[PDB]
């Protein structure tokens, strides 16, 4: 049963792209403890048209993380984060790290540091020393979260999904020292948290339309596609916050629940504006829309144009 796959090149080899796929042996649920694991290597011959099995290096734990890092491959098998190199017979592990809490579920590698995502614990920032081949964790989080997917937004800001239907974004402090040697000293503060309500498993920050602005497009397990766009103006963010505060009082949800309670299911809301609740201003009552526009000192077509401007700037 395969769980991870990666396609990159090795520093010891030439320009031949190798496809490494980690698999497990005798696994199922929590009652049936995982037995062993293996990592098959492919050649990607005919310019990526045919794959040839070069070697299959076994492992003691089930590998759930494979990512290239400075010409080598980072292999996370269970709670052991190991840096393996390309070998003629098997993948020679050049480094190893056993500082994981339960199991390494995901791994996103920056150009200088490495960010591994645990199963029940939040993702931690780890620096890899190239001189001594020793990976040292220099940052961690204060709140545990069942992370399913993550994406690096910047060199110090990382946004990760939650298994409970939430979305969080953690940013490292600027005074954090990467060169070092309850759990960790330096902690990472969560700058944004929002309960989306659906199980997110894919996050990607890119441009959906050429000429527009890049947004945090996220997927859902229920067949839904969403996008998170940052506010460019503080006055526009305050106007959107006032519009959301007016809409939470003027148009309640039909399920009898509170919007703030729905957004604060797993984690409290921090710098998040639900555009779907703001989109109901055109569908609500005209007298209530006129009252909300008089409270916002504008017109209802002006509010509709202000709502459509962000959608035209950030989406298709």
């Amino acid at each position: 049963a395969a769980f991870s796959v990666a396609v990159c090149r090795f520093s010891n080899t030439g320009e031949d792209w190798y496809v490494l796929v980690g698999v497990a042996k005798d696994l199922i649920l929590n009652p049936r403890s995982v037995a062993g694991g293996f990592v098959y290597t492919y050649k990607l011959v005919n310019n990526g048209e045919k794959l040839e099995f070069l070697h299959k290096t076994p492992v003691e734990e089930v590998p759930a993380a494979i990512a290239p890092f400075q010409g080598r491959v980072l292999i996370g098998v269970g709670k052991l984060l190991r840096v393996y190199d390309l070998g003629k017979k098997k993948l020679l592990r050049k480094c190893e790290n056993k500082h994981i809490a339960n199991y390494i579920s995901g791994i996103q590698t920056i150009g200088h540091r490495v960010i591994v995502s645990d199963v029940q614990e939040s993702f931690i920032w780890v620096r890899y020393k190239r001189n001594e081949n020793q990976l040292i964790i220099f940052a961690d989080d204060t709140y545990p979260r069942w992370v399913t997917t993550a994406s690096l937004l910047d060199y110090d800001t990382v946004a990760g999904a939650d298994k409970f239907g939430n979305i969080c974004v953690v940013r490292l402090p600027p005074n954090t020292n990467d060169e070092v040697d309850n759990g960790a000293s330096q902690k990472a503060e969560v700058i944004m948290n929002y309960h989306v309500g659906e199980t997110v498993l894919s996050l990607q920050k890119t441009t959906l339309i050429p000429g527009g602005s890049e947004s945090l497009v996220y997927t859902t397990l229920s067949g839904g596609i969403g996008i998170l766009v940052p506010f460019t103006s503080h006055e526009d963010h305050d106007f959107f916050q006032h519009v959301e505060m007016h809409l939470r009082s003027e148009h309640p949800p039909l399920c009898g629940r509170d919007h703030l309670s729905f957004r604060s299911y797993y984690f409290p809301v921090k710098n998040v504006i639900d555009g779907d609740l703001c989109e109901q201003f055109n569908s609500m009552e005209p007298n209530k829309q006129k009252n909300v526009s008089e409270e916002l000192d504008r017109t209802p077509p002006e509010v509709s144009k202000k709502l459509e401007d962000i959608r035209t700037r950030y989406a298709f």
Binding site: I209, P210, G211, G212, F239, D309, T312, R313
Partner: peptide, 21 residues
């Protein structure tokens, strides 16, 4: 708001240009 609005219009300009590309 107004000053920003002037800027906002420019903001729109960029997206519109993007569409053209």
């Amino acid at each position: 708001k107004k000053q920003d609005l002037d800027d906002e219009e420019k903001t729109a300009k960029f997206i519109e240009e993007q569409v053209r590309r």
